[PDB]
């Protein structure tokens, strides 16, 4: 739980820093699988599975 | 949480990849449609 909280905080700070990344990840879209692919290509193995 | 510049390619992997948009609002003969990047 502590590790997950730290990783989520890091991801939130990253989204804050990467304004373009945050905008592209936040723009509404019906499809989700490409968003999942982008997220995995970003931090698939850097952070834990949860 | 080390993030490399390859993330840029990631979004490039997204931007480059029929199209159906969605009406987000409509009023007085004017509609607004989300999506349709190739329109």
Descriptive keywords:
part of a larger assembly; 2 chains; A: mainly alpha; 3 helices; 0% strand; globular; B: 39 residues; alpha+beta; two-stranded antiparallel ribbon; 26% helix; 28% strand; ATP synthase subunit b-delta (chain A); ATP synthase subunit alpha (chain B)
Helix content of chain B: 25-40%
First-residue to last-residue Cα separation of chain A: 10 Å
Sketch the topology of chain A as an H/E string, one letter per element.
HHH
* Beta fraction of chain A: under 5%
> Using only CA atoms, what is the Rg of chain A?
12 Å
Global outline of chain A: globular
Organism (chain B): Mycolicibacterium smegmatis (strain ATCC 700084 / mc(2)155) (Mycobacterium smegmatis)
Family (chain B): Belongs to the ATPase alpha/beta chains family.
Subcellular location (chain B): Cell membrane
Function (chain B): Produces ATP from ADP in the presence of a proton gradient across the membrane. The alpha chain is a regulatory subunit.
Folded structure, characterized:
- Chain A is built from 3 helices and no strands.
- Chain A is mainly alpha-helical and 50 residues long.
- The longest helix of chain A has 16 residues, at 2-17.
- In chain B, strand 1 (22-27) and strand 2 form a beta hairpin.
- A two-stranded antiparallel sheet of chain B has the order 1-2.
- Chain B starts with 5 loop residues before the first helix and ends in a 5-residue tail after the last strand.
- The A-B interface holds A 7, 10-11, 13-14, 18, 20-21, 24, 28-30, 34, 37-38, 41-43, 46-47 and B 1-3, 7, 10-11, 13-14, 17, 20, 22, 34-35.
